[PDB]
């Protein structure tokens, strides 16, 4: 996915879909989050829609292709059981002058 240079804060840039090929009957709900290494001070916000989709929102006003042209967002999908099991999918966000599947295993 991508973000515009003149993008303002709280702007939706992409929607993520948590997929479990081993769940034919849609019994599993997945919790979204940023991996521990990216959970604080990101330039993006994850909003869990609570229906196996999450939004990637801009957390800052303006992105400079020269300062940082690409962001690697490690997104955690987690089950809701004891013990908890998680999977990680890295999202590549590109800065430009101006649907996404995360699998559970």
């Amino acid at each position, epitope marked *: 996915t991508f973000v515009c240079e003149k993008a303002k804060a709280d702007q939706l840039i992409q929607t993520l879909h948590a997929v479990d090929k081993d769940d034919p009957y849609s*019994g599993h709900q997945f919790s979204f989050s940023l991996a521990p290494e990216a*959970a*604080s001070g990101s330039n993006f916000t*994850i909003q869990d829609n609570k229906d196996n989709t999450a939004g990637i929102l801009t957390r800052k006003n303006g992105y400079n292709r020269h300062e940082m042209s690409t962001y690697l967002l490690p997104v955690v999908i987690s089950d809701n059981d004891y013990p*908890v099991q998680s999977s990680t999918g890295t999202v590549t966000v590109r800065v430009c002058a101006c649907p996404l599947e995360v699998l559970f295993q």
Partner: antibody
């Protein structure tokens, strides 16, 4: 949609026993870890017990270990908390809660008050 | 157990104010730090998951940050409906899970 309906609270004497129930609906019950979290009047939140989706794996806070038992009936979509050897310090509002990810709580019951008194 | 301490225990603020609630852990915790809103006579509602994940139907004025031992919940533009007691919770070395003592937010008027 997601609903957690509690029952079973009330007056019980010290050394007594009480059973709480939590009827679930609006989601796949067996897919979630289910928990008991209590709040003493005018105080904070205290996690009590956990049970896996299957009902095989259980956990307890040190404060209730050996006195309380958590169970679930997946056929009836019901969570239980069997309390025994009740003490004055067990007096609280008891909530059942659905697990979200790594033990955060996204849906809670209305609560049920348990008063331990002679 | 890991003890979670919130500051302040009570706060009073004006509509439009940027309010901050601090959460300190007795030891370094990873990123399993969650935030709750509890309205009087109601059960807690999950606002923020794993330090910064905004929940569905939670206004974007609610945000979280922090690492190690210090965490923050920020309400960027306080609204009259934000009246409640807020709790932080550590859930990264489970069992057990421990909560902060709560921060009551009062609306100045």
């Amino acid at each position: 949609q997601v609903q957690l309906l509690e029952s079973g609270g009330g007056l019980v004497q010290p050394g007594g026993s009480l059973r709480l129930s939590c009827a679930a609906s609006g989601f796949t019950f067996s897919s979630h870890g289910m928990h008991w979290v209590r709040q003493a009047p005018g105080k904070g939140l205290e996690w009590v017990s956990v049970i896996s989706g299957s009902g095989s794996n259980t956990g307890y806070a040190d404060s209730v270990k050996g006195r309380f038992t958590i169970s679930r009936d997946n056929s009836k979509n019901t969570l239980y908390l069997q309390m025994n050897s009740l003490r004055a310090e067990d007096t609280a509002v008891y909530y059942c809660a659905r697990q979200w990810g790594s033990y955060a709580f996204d849906s809670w019951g209305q609560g049920t008050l348990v008063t331990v008194s002679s | 157990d890991i003890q979670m301490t919130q500051s302040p225990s009570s706060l009073s603020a004006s509509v439009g104010d940027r309010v901050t609630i601090t959460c300190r852990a007795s030891q370094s915790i990873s990123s399993y730090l969650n935030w709750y809103q509890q309205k009087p006579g109601k059960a807690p509602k999950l606002l923020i998951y794993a330090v910064s994940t905004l929940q569905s139907g939670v206004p974007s004025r609610f945000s979280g940050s922090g690492s190690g031992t210090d965490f923050t919940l920020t309400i960027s533009s306080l609204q009259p409906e934000d009246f409640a007691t807020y709790y932080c919770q550590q859930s990264g070395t489970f069992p057990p899970t421990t909560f902060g003592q709560g921060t009551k937010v009062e609306i100045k008027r």
